[PDB]
Design a protein around this ligand. Structure first.
Ligand SMILES: CCCCCCCCCCCCO[C@@H]1O[C@H](CO)[C@@H](O[C@H]2O[C@H](CO)[C@@H](O)[C@H](O)[C@H]2O)[C@H](O)[C@H]1O
Ligand SMILES: CCCCCCCCCCCCO[C@@H]1O[C@H](CO)[C@@H](O[C@H]2O[C@H](CO)[C@@H](O)[C@H](O)[C@H]2O)[C@H](O)[C@H]1O
Lengths: 144, 240, 240, 155, 457, 48, 48
């Protein structure tokens, strides 16, 4: 949160990249670090490689590199997913009477819908387009 | 609650007045980040990106998703609506339907062509049995090798129709000729007719294998696509 | 035994112990490897012009070669015969005592003044109505040279004179450790001691290493040269 | 304007041919982005000598300042563009130009240790005793950075 | 939108894009999903995508109401939009696989040159690529350009002099301007995050920096301006790395008529003339093509060899197999004529179509040659006599199969509905291929057999 | 085989009496004689 | 450690369980959250 492209690269991306060793059937590794405070390192493996073995080998090398990352990045945590997959469908959730914001709708979907759709027969993965609520403390410097 | 966060004590002044968090900040339930603004026809929008599970049925999964969302309808706040901007199941529905249509129309076309030339319903019924048997068999081989019903494997069977239909026509037509030219009964005519083509049909099977099988041994993404058509056509041809 | 599952199971249990280990041990990085105990080959690196010392070569190998070799399939373990450079702060106890300072003050000052700070953005989300400017805020960044570490301010005396880190310590680029010193025919050298990953083919892995080394050679500094002082794989190929 | 924004990108990119065509068609030389950088600011920063000369020939403000009071001479001096520092000074660049921080081209040149530029600035009458908001001179920066060669020049 | 463009400015453009699709394309467009702040090539306030969802294919008759038409009309309409790059484009056939048209190039920093020098080396390559329109087209960076950023220096001496700790300064700045994830709370039985951050109006412009105060050891409140200085500089809003080294991804494609393999060879030639310590590599579709291209020759060889060996065993001769293998072009010419006429491409569906077309044409010839050879071997008939008797017997079953199969693929050729692009690629190449394979083979197969039999014994 | 090693005993009473913290003693001894990995820096574009 | 069954269910069990979707050959999932702060989530898979 609040990190620039260079901060993310030089504290997170470089540290993780250096620890992506001893992993089998790796073809190439690519990453980008942006000014939104985000890093995405994609590791592409040989065709016919077990995606589960590939993922756990990457996860395991990341876990041992976690103590080398900043405290704020350890808090947020670091997701390791199979990205090669695509979407079956996109369920849109909207508000027509203009009583709910995108934040209000996202929280309802996260709380009352997502889990039930995840448990539905034949559903492999569910991704929320938005986030659940957060307790926002909007500080005032004049009052502080 | 926001109320409790508001009452968080920061400082107690000399005079005894209390400085709470709500005195130095605005407190509300908001988003984790505000980088993305999502709108559906101008209206505030969220959504769920759903992926299909390994070895699952897309058409069954989509039906089950719509059934589960229908049970949630009664508990939705006023104004909340479900929409389907992206859905890939209509494809697979039409892809399977248009395949079934082509294979049915193919059998109907063979029946008409068989009757036009041979002019007996008994002759037209042999391909009408043989073709379905080969097609069903192909699915069993498809399942055995761990392949799925998809756009590539579905059009793979359509592209193989010519080879399947030919095997049926060649065998029956050749018997009808032998009888017409030599006057042999059906049984004796079939023994001789098969005696002429049995060696070639086996040869043809080996030749066509050599054309399609090596196509499956390409590497990467292109190889994966080719392997769908290769294994489907070779299996269908081999059973035919 | 499947080496992949063995490694997974061993690491699953290690992760329960990791939190109980001293912070200094965790920050050195704990590793879990599946490899032979013996070396597959030793990739040696020398400078024929003598323009780079053993320390210079060791840093270049560690910084430009080792990581890519370590990521190559079949490479279970890579031992650097030498050390990568670190910013060495060689403290002086006489000078520290003179200015009433300790290694604790030096460590605190370095953590404070060699910092990569997330400072946010101008016109960041959620923004006010009518914002035209959006730009990243850049604060402190990691120091890049001995000079920058040198002018780290430890304290300001009562008279106003500044105590810099270079006043209480000598500052240079030097190995993380000074334990491992390698030579090739009595000549300054570094190298990578490569161990074969469990079950991996020795010859295929050797070929993959040479292919990756070939991609590095074109961008070497003047004099730097790969030598092959120990390889078990030529025997395997030739014997057959 | 359209051409004004095309000139900013062209000046930054160092496309000498595109700048020429824009000067003929009359692209605004005083055009400024949201941070207040002119084509001359950008040309000076990225070190495009020929475009700096072309822009100054077409009546560009040599003493243009951004929203933090920094001028093209600040940028040229800071990023070690000797030939651009000379051209700017020859066309009447304020050698003692102070930004909102009280920082001068000499302060910036001294900090990065550009010995040639420091002497060029001093030759055009750079105030060696000039202090920033913290009361620091070019000499204070030189002894703090430990640049003995630079420290010797400023006396 | 251009560099440093805000969320509000991007939203106004997406509103125009949304308004157009629900106004000018009311009959075609069902919904517009406007995602402000995200782009595939890079994120930020200056980027956004509008996902357009159309009505059912049945409610969109004719090419005029298809995606390619709507795309062209939309791209032309949005050309007029000022200070924003706006264009529509269709999805790839397989979304899993990506665009998969052109090449995917990685420019690599191999000797710690740095971001600025890699940019200069990139600009040099793009400039040189632009001098060859005849070979390379739309050679561009995939990533984002450097943007103005607000560099603030904390004066260590002034902070220590005033008794203000650096942790307090960097926490105050980071928390207020950037936001800070403090800890978790439980909202209606669900764990959720607590974020502290400045209210919008106090973290917008550089003047707001001075309104933030930090408490010193002596208890005095010191403004941020007292111990800080600020200047504008340029920096990357998105830094790329490839195999652990700093990189910049470059996309491009072969010019009309030229193959991708040729376009790659030029990019390699141009790359070798770049400054010292600047390397390159091929990734994605390019990496896949180079390895797939290296396999093709050996697979074609194995295919032809085994085909010949099987026929040689069937007919018990090294020569007669050639009489069958000579039909290959008779079917391929018809597929190419039909593909070139209808304006389709040499795609996967067309390529598999050729093999099945070649397959059935080969089958027709195999039986003609078998019968002709059998008549000569067993009944002792002459070459021409046996050939004439073979083609006579083979005429009816060849015409029955051809008539049935040509009519069978007719719906796929003329289909304009859902999945028609595939059906067209299947039917077109097969129909045209079958027509020529049927018409030519019945006349050319007997010529092949007679000529081969005459030449060898 | 076993080797001579320099055994040093910190006196807790004296440390407490002089107002010297045990954290400062252990860090001073450990950092000086053993070495301390403080944090990372960037050497020509690479974290070290 | 120190957490009641309700607290640890809301902060651990449900957080884990809601991520245990799209695993191959999953028959059923049973879990318990107790007063010692202990969570145990058992996933049973298809025979073979
Ligand atoms: C020429 C005839 C020869 C006989 C052999 C050919 C058999 C038919 C070929 C297609 C094989 C797959 O057939 C396909 O199976 C899947 C289940 O996996 C079905 O899938 C779906 O069916 C119905 C269709 O309304 C849905 O409501 C349901 O949710 C789902 O199960 C398809 O509707 C069916 O068409
Ligand atoms: C009915 C029977 C069907 C028969 C099916 C037979 C199985 C097919 C075997 C496929 C095995 C792959 O075949 C193997 O591919 C590799 C590439 O990866 C080739 O390797 C190739 O590399 C270089 C690349 O510059 C080529 O120039 C060269 O012509 C060739 O040697 C091997 O020469 C080939 O033997």
């Amino acid at each position: 949160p609040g990190a620039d492209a260079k901060t993310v690269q030089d504290t997170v991306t470089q540290v993780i990249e250096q620890n992506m060793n001893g992993i089998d059937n790796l073809m190439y590794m690519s990453s980008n670090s942006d000014s939104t405070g985000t890093v995405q390192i994609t590791l592409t493996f040989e065709s016919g490689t077990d995606a589960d073995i590939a993922q756990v080998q990457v996860q395991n090398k990341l876990q041992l590199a976690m103590p080398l990352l900043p405290q704020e990045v350890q808090q947020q945590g670091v997701s390791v997913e199979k990205s090669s997959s695509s979407f079956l469908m996109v369920v849109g959730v909207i508000n027509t009477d203009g009583t709910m914001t995108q934040e209000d709708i996202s929280d309802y979907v996260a709380a009352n819908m997502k889990d039930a759709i995840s448990r539905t027969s034949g559903v492999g993965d569910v991704q929320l387009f938005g986030s659940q609520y957060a307790m926002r403390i909007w500080m005032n410097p004049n009052e502080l | 609650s926001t109320e409790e966060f508001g009452k968080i004590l920061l400082k107690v002044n000399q005079d005894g007045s209390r400085v709470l968090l709500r005195d130095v900040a605005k407190i509300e339930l908001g988003g984790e980040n505000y980088d993305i603004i999502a709108e559906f026809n101008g209206q505030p929008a969220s959504g769920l990106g759903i992926k299909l599970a390994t070895g699952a049925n897309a058409l069954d999964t989509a039906a089950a998703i719509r059934a589960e969302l229908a049970k949630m309808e009664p508990f939705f706040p006023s104004g909340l609506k479900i929409v389907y901007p992206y859905d890939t199941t209509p494809f697979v529905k039409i892809s399977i339907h248009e395949v079934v249509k082509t294979l049915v129309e193919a059998i109907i076309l063979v029946f008409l062509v068989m009757y036009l030339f041979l002019q007996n319903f008994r002759a037209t019924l042999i391909p009408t049995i043989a073709v379905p048997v080969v097609l069903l068999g192909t699915f069993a081989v498809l399942a055995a090798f761990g392949f799925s019903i998809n756009t590539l494997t579905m059009f793979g069977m359509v592209l193989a129709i010519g080879l399947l239909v030919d095997d049926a026509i060649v065998v029956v037509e050749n018997v009808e000729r032998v009888m017409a030219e030599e006057g042999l009964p059906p049984k004796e005519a079939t023994r001789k007719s098969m005696g002429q083509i049995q060696g070639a049909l086996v040869g043809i099977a080996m030749v066509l294998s050599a054309v399609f099988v090596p196509m499956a041994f390409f590497g990467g993404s292109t190889g994966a696509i080719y392997r769908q058509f290769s294994i489907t056509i070779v299996s269908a041809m081999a059973l035919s | 035994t499947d080496a992949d599952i063995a490694q997974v199971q061993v690491q699953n249990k290690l992760q329960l112990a990791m939190p109980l280990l001293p912070q200094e041990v965790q920050q050195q990085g704990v590793s879990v490897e599946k490899s032979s105990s013996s070396f597959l080959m030793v990739v040696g690196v020398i400078n024929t012009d003598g323009t780079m010392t053993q320390e210079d070569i060791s840093d270049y190998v560690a910084a430009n070669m080792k990581d890519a070799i370590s990521r190559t399939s079949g490479v279970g373990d890579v031992q650097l015969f030498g050390s990568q450079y670190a910013m060495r702060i060689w403290m002086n106890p006489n000078e520290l005592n003179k200015f009433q300072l300790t290694p604790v003050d030096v460590i605190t000052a370095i953590k404070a003044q060699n910092a990569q700070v997330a400072a946010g953005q101008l016109g960041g989300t959620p923004p006010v109505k009518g914002q035209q400017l959006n730009a990243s805020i850049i604060a402190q960044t990691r120091l890049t040279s001995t000079e920058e570490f040198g002018k780290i301010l430890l304290k300001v005396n009562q008279d106003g004179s500044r105590v810099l880190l270079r006043d209480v310590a000598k500052i240079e680029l030097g190995g993380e450790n000074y334990d491992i010193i390698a030579e090739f025919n009595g000549q300054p050298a570094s190298g990578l001691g490569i161990k074969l990953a469990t079950g991996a083919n020795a010859l295929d892995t050797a070929a993959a290493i040479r292919a990756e080394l070939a991609k590095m050679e074109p961008f070497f500094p003047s004099g730097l040269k790969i030598v092959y002082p120990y390889d078990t794989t030529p025997f395997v190929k030739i014997s057959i | 304007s359209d051409l004004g924004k095309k000139l900013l990108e062209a000046a930054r990119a160092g496309r000498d041919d595109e700048v020429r065509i824009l000067m003929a068609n009359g692209a605004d030389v005083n055009a400024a982005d949201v941070v207040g950088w002119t084509p001359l600011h950008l040309a000076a920063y990225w070190g495009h000598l020929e475009i700096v000369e072309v822009l100054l020939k077409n009546g560009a403000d040599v003493n243009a300042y951004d929203t933090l009071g920094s001028t093209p001479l600040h940028l040229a001096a800071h990023f070690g563009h000797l030939e651009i520092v000379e051209v700017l000074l020859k066309n009447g660049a304020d050698v003692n130009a102070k930004d909102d921080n009280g920082i001068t081209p000499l302060h910036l040149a001294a900090n990065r240790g550009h010995l040639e530029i420091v002497e060029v600035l001093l030759k055009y009458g750079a105030d060696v005793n000039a202090q920033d908001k913290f009361g620091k001179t070019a000499f204070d920066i030189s002894i703090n950075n430990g640049n003995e060669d630079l420290a010797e020049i400023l006396q | 939108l251009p560099a440093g463009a805000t969320q509000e400015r991007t939203q106004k453009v997406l509103n125009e894009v949304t308004h157009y699709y629900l106004t000018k394309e009311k009959n075609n467009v069902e919904s517009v999903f406007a995602v402000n702040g995200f782009g595939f090539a890079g994120r930020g306030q200056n980027t956004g995508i509008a996902f357009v969802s159309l009505k059912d294919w049945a409610d969109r008759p004719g090419e005029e109401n298809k995606v390619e038409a709507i795309t062209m009309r939309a791209t032309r309409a949005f050309s007029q939009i000022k200070d924003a790059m706006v264009f529509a484009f269709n999805l790839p056939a397989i979304v899993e696989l990506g665009t998969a048209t052109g090449f995917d190039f990685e420019l690599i920093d191999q000797a710690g040159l740095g971001h600025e020098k890699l940019t200069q080396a990139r600009n040099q390559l793009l400039a040189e690529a632009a001098k060859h329109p005849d070979m390379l087209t739309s050679v561009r960076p995939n990533g984002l350009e450097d943007t103005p950023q607000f560099k603030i220096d904390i004066d260590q001496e002034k902070a220590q002099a005033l008794g203000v700790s650096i942790n307090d300064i960097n926490t105050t700045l980071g928390a207020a301007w950037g936001g800070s994830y403090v800890n978790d709370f439980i909202d209606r039985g669900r764990v959720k995050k607590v974020y502290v951050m400045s209210e919008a109006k106090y973290r917008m412009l550089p003047d707001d920096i001075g309104d933030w105060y930090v408490r010193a050891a002596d208890g005095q409140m010191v403004p941020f301006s007292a111990f800080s200085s600020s200047r504008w500089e340029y920096g990357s809003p998105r830094l790329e790395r490839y195999n652990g080294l700093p990189s910049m991804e470059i996309l491009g494609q072969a010019a009309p008529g030229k193959s991708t393999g040729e376009a790659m060879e030029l990019m390699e030639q141009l790359a070798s003339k770049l400054p010292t310590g600047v390397g390159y590599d091929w990734t994605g579709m390019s990496y896949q093509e180079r390895l797939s291209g290296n396999q093709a020759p050996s697979l074609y060889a194995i295919s032809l060899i085994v085909v010949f060996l099987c026929l040689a065993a069937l007919y018990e001769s090294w020569s007669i197999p050639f009489s069958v293998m000579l039909v290959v072009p008779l079917g391929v010419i018809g597929a190419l004529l039909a593909a070139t006429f209808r304006g389709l491409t040499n795609d996967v569906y067309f390529q598999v179509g050729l093999l099945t077309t070649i397959g059935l044409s080969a089958k027709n010839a195999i039986l003609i040659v078998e019968f002709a050879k059998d008549l000569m071997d067993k009944e002792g008939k002459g070459l021409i006599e046996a050939t004439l008797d073979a083609v006579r017997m083979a005429l009816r079953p060849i015409l029955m199969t051809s008539l049935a199969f040509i009519l069978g693929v007719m719906p796929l050729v003329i289909s304009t509905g859902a999945g028609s692009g595939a059906q067209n690629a299947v039917g077109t190449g097969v129909m045209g291929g079958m027509v020529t394979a049927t018409v030519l083979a019945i006349f050319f197969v007997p010529v092949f057999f007679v000529v081969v039999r005459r030449r060898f014994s």
